[PDB]
Amino acid sequence: SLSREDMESVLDKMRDHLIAKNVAADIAVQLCESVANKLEGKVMGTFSTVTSTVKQALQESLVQILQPQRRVDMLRDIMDAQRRQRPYVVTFCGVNGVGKSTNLAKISFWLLENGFSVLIAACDTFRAGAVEQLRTHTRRLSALHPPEKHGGRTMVQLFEKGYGKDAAGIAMEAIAFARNQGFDVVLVDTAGRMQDNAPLMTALAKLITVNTPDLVLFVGEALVGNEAVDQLVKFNRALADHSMAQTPRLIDGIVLTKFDTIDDKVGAAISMTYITSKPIVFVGTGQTYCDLRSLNAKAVVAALMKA
Amino acid sequence: NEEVLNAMLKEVCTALLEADVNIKLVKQLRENVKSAIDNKRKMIQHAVFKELVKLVDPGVKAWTPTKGKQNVIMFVGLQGSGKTTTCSKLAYYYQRKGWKTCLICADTFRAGAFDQLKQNATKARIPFYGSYTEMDPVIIASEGVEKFKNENFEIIIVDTSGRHKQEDSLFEEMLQVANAIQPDNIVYVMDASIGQACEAQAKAFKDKVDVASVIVTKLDGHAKGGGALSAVAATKSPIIFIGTGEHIDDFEPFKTQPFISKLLG
Numbered sequence: 001s002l003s004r005e006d007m008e009s010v011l012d013k014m015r016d017h018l019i020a021k022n023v024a025a026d027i028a029v030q031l032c033e034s035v036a037n038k039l040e041g042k043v044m045g046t047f048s049t050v051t052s053t054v055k056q057a058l059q060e061s062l063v064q065i066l067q068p069q070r071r072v073d074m075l076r077d078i079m080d081a082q083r084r085q086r087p088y089v090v091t092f093c094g095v096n097g098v099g100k101s102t103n104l105a106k107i108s109f110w111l112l113e114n115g116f117s118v119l120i121a122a123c124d125t126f127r128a129g130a131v132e133q134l135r136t137h138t139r140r141l142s143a144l145h146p147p148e149k150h151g152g153r154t155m156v157q158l159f160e161k162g163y164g165k166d167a168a169g170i171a172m173e174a175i176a177f178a179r180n181q182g183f184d185v186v187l188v189d190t191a192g193r194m195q196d197n198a199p200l201m202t203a204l205a206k207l208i209t210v211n212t213p214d215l216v217l218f219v220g221e222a223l224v225g226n227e228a229v230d231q232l233v234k235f236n237r238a239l240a241d242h243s244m245a246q247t248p249r250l251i252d253g254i255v256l257t258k259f260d261t262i263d264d265k266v267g268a269a270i271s272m273t274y275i276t277s278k279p280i281v282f283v284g285t286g287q288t289y290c291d292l293r294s295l296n297a298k299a300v301v302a303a304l305m306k307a
Numbered sequence: 308n309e310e311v312l313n314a315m316l317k318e319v320c321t322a323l324l325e326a327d328v329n330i331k332l333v334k335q336l337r338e339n340v341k342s343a344i345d346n347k348r349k350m351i352q353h354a355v356f357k358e359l360v361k362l363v364d365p366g367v368k369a370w371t372p373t374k375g376k377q378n379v380i381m382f383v384g385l386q387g388s389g390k391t392t393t394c395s396k397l398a399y400y401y402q403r404k405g406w407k408t409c410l411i412c413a414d415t416f417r418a419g420a421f422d423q424l425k426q427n428a429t430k431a432r433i434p435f436y437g438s439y440t441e442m443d444p445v446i447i448a449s450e451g452v453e454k455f456k457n458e459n460f461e462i463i464i465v466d467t468s469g470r471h472k473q474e475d476s477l478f479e480e481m482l483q484v485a486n487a488i489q490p491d492n493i494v495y496v497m498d499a500s501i502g503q504a505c506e507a508q509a510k511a512f513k514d515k516v517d518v519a520s521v522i523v524t525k526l527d528g529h530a531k532g533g534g535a536l537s538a539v540a541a542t543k544s545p546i547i548f549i550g551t552g553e554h555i556d557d558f559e560p561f562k563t564q565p566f567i568s569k570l571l572g
């Protein structure tokens with residue numbers, strides 16, 4: 001049979017490996033202890049070894065964590081939003097410099113490419129240059145998607161009330177604007193905040209509670225370490241406490257960015273989809289509009305198992 | 308008693324792993340505190356603390372500007388690590404101490420990069436240079452340093468765009484900016500939340516350009532900044548300042564003792 005004592009060392013090697021490939025330390029621990037429980041008291045295959053057995057077990061549970069039950073078909077959800085004659089509202093949020101604003105632009109490009117109109121709501125009213133940053137994007141996009149290429153319709157537009165104003169109220173006026181001017185999607189950009197800055201997390205929660213977006217997306221850099229876990233736990237804990245609903249609106253999906261910087265230390269993807277049981281909706285792989293990928297769960301796990 | 312060392316020691320290996328210290332370093336620190344050790348959690352936690360100090364200290368004193376000469380400081384680092392904000396942070400630091408300081412924006416890529424630095428600099432009443440139109444960072448940085456030289460500035464801080472080791476193009480462009488303005492100090496700015504991918508990038512930066520100082524940002528939150536041990540290792544450079552928030556005065560000079568304390572528990 002397979003006792004815990006036999007697996008003890010190969011399990012320890014796996015844990016250390018996963019940790020080295022940027023899976024959060026406690027997740028690696030929990031991950032491997034699951035593999036232990038699953039295997040205890042079972043017999044191995046005719047030609048299998050204790051190593052090959054736990055290796056395969058680990059690989060399967062990794063694939064399952066990465067592709068979770070709930071998918072997020074975004075264009076399909078937008079199609080449905082169009083039947084109800086309301087805009088589809090997406091809120092991006094996350095800690096500082098992870099790539100909210102820039103991946104919001106990439107997603108706009110993707111939406112425009114499928115023929116939806118998007119109003120970008122500039123609801124980072126704090127950080128220097130946030131508005132001009134989004135303005136630059138809007139200018140770049142509506143040059144790629146001008147009215148003369150869409151029957152005269154304006155397809156992207158920035159909604160901005162400059163710096164200093166309440167984010168939630170701007171988001172509200174934008175969604176209100178999109179309804180009246182016929183914008184298919186509103187993408188709400190929000191300012192970067194630390195996950196345990198009470199005032200800022202309440203502000204974020206207020207913007208979400210007040211405007212009830214269709215999709216809240218957490219944005220996290222793939223470079224991040226153990227912080228991946230804390231950021232999500234506390235963001236999700238903030239949306240649930242500073243909310244006055246029965247089943248409160250939590251984080252719906254993840255945008256894993258800077259994937260092009262981590263080589264095969266690809267572990268942050270496991271860290272995030274393990275705590276939230278939500279899907280990685282897009283992977284960000286660079287700085288241009290073209291650098292947006294889906295998440296190939298089989299192939300990410302492959303990179304994680306290799307070194 | 309061999310079991311009371313290890314139980315108390317794998318408990319410290321875990322704290323450090325959770326603090327984003329490179330696993331290589333933990334595996335090494337463990338058998339270092341073990342070899343060198345031959346009321347009980349003090350005889351151990353002290354010898355761990357000492358080995359950690361050896362890791363933050365590169366053995367090199369930090370570069371400092373001289374009053375009355377031209378001091379050019381160039382910032383580099385991964386995308387979104389906090390260079391730009393830390394630029395105005397550092398200028399405001401020197402300016403308040405009575406130096407003639409100024410900021411140059413040599414980012415020609417990031418949307419609204421110049422607007423960002425211009426608003427930062429304008430709020431803090433600090434002279435800046437940059438361009439909405441010029442697309443070659445080397446020309447802005449050159450013509451910027453050249454401008455502020457002619458006006459006898461003491462601290463000329465040059466902000467550059469975020470870049471990462473696998474984009475060979477961007478790493479060349481960095482070396483080209485360095486060669487053009489010939490900085491007296493290159494600062495590598497790093498996010499305190501960075502995971503295991505840190506050593507690799509930092510080495511890559513130091514291998515291409517001459518990094519001589521490190522600043523750690525975003526330490527005001529939950530991250531203990533254990534990546535800094537690897538950054539110091541890779542760049543052979545001391546941590547000079549830490550960033551502790553979004554504002555211009557959320558900045559203080561790095562002190563070794565409190566940082567290792569916070570890193571440990």
Ligand SMILES: Nc1nc2c(ncn2[C@@H]2O[C@H](COP(=O)(O)OP(=O)(O)NP(=O)(O)O)[C@@H](O)[C@H]2O)c(=O)[nH]1
Nearest residue numbers: 096097098099100101102192258284285286386387
């Ligand atoms: N290599 C790489 N860089 C990326 C990726 N996504 C974003 N970036 C870069 O990372 C930096 C972060 O950009 P930004 O979008 O402003 O992030 P942010 O989270 O909005 N910042 P803020 O906290 O101030 O709102 C930018 O320089 C952007 O070009 C990615 O997938 N790969």
Ligand SMILES: Nc1nc2c(ncn2[C@@H]2O[C@H](COP(=O)(O)OP(=O)(O)NP(=O)(O)O)[C@@H](O)[C@H]2O)c(=O)[nH]1
Nearest residue numbers: 096097386387388389390391392469525550551552
């Ligand atoms: N809480 C906190 N936020 C910080 C700190 N330093 C920077 N920030 C914030 O982090 C974000 C990124 O800063 P920024 O200077 O734009 O990054 P960058 O790396 O210079 N720019 P680039 O995208 O070109 O790489 C901004 O929201 C900035 O205000 C810090 O020490 N603490």
Ligand SMILES: Nc1ncnc2c1ncn2[C@@H]1O[C@H](COP(=O)(O)O)[C@@H](O)[C@H]1O
Nearest residue numbers: 125126127191192193194200552553554
């Ligand atoms: N990312 C952020 N978004 C919104 N407010 C912030 C952020 N970071 C800090 N603050 C706080 O917002 C207030 C704005 O101050 P000021 O920018 O000086 O007008 C201060 O109380 C700051 O501490």
Ligand SMILES: [Mg+2]
Nearest residue numbers: 100101124190
């Ligand atoms: Mg932003």
Ligand SMILES: [Mg+2]
Nearest residue numbers: 390391417469
């Ligand atoms: Mg910058």
